[PDB]
Write a protein that binds this ligand. Structure first.
Ligand SMILES: O=c1ccn([C@H]2C[C@H](O)[C@@H](COP(=O)(O)NP(=O)(O)OP(=O)(O)O)O2)c(=O)[nH]1
Ligand SMILES: O=c1ccn([C@H]2C[C@H](O)[C@@H](COP(=O)(O)NP(=O)(O)OP(=O)(O)O)O2)c(=O)[nH]1
Ligand SMILES: O=c1ccn([C@H]2C[C@H](O)[C@@H](COP(=O)(O)NP(=O)(O)OP(=O)(O)O)O2)c(=O)[nH]1
Ligand SMILES: [Mg+2]
Ligand SMILES: [Mg+2]
Ligand SMILES: [Mg+2]
Lengths: 113, 113, 113
């Protein structure tokens, strides 16, 4: 397992930490949403949570990443939820296909289910 | 009307406050975007705004939630904008179909329209 | 070029800064993702980054905006990544078709690629 500290930024001013595919994946529109493995695991820094979003270059090439929330204390594998929009898309292993953005976790008095 | 204080978290560390359907809704891809009623109303805590996002389990079952912004002082009903991706989707009344995340509202000098 | 200080809010409590189309654009579903020009340029205020999101009224009329990240130090043109969902959509020049939300940029020790 690899932790989020292993992710890299494109540039010092990049908001997102890039996430790569651990497998070669081919997606077609009729497949619908697929969960792609990253080999990167939570949890996140104290008092933060995450959002998974598409990289703009990847979105423009027709692979939609559905926004995902990563809880502060999630310790499982971060997966990228993705769909080929209207053409066949091919994801080569190790290609950066999404990004993790970190956001402050606001506390409230809402109850637990 | 019910306020956001009535929403619950799945777990103490969950970033999102879950939102449920007040009606049974069936969606087909050819319907396009539909606004689903939640019976939950703004406004949000001081100095915060909201984002509405899909739950990952729901996204994976083919119901796309389009990200929505909830203004700090919105006092209307929070609706979930949703679309069946490529199969028929059925939403039973009371099923959790989206989540509200709270974020800090940054002040700027931008003018009002 | 116009900076983000030129954008307006719908109301004092609106979370997003609205973004308009500089061109008339017609989109069909088979076109897939298109990058629409706004004539608005980064960079963003110190210690912030941006998210580009759809306006709810626009989403409901069948134009999907794919969420986009705007880095703090991006100095290029902010483009709106958009797709017609399942009908033909027409965007008249100057119509507000997305919004920019500003978020705190969290610093980490992650390395640069
Ligand atoms: O894109 C994503 C979204 C979520 N996740 C993981 C991390 C997150 O903390 C966890 C739960 O996310 P959601 O609350 O969106 N899913 P859901 O509500 O269906 O599951 P749960 O009931 O456990 O909260 O799923 C991903 O790995 N990728
Ligand atoms: O998913 C959503 C998105 C928005 N909303 C409500 C809350 C928000 O404050 C309000 C306005 O959101 P937008 O600014 O995204 N919509 P739009 O720009 O079309 O309307 P307005 O001109 O009033 O700002 O709509 C929802 O209930 N669900
Ligand atoms: O909707 C968007 C998304 C991004 N952008 C611009 C601003 C942002 O700082 C820049 C890079 O965004 P991403 O990191 O999402 N794209 P990508 O990873 O493909 O390019 P790079 O490798 O340069 O980071 O693209 C837009 O103008 N509109
Ligand atoms: Mg990038
Ligand atoms: Mg959940
Ligand atoms: Mg608005």
């Amino acid at each position: 397992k690899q932790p989020i500290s292993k992710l890299t930024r494109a540039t010092p001013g990049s908001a997102g930490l890039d996430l790569c595919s651990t497998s070669h994946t081919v997606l077609t529109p009729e497949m619908g949403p697929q969960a792609l493995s990253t080999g990167i695991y939570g949890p996140l820094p104290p008092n933060t949570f995450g959002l998974i979003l598409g990289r703009s270059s990847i979105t423009m090439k027709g692979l939609q990443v559905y926004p995902g929330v990563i809880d502060n204390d999630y310790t499982g594998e971060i997966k990228i939820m993705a769909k080929a929009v209207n053409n066949i898309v091919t994801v080569s292993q190790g290609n950066r296909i999404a990004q993790l953005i970190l956001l402050p976790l606001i506390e409230t008095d809402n109850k637990v289910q």
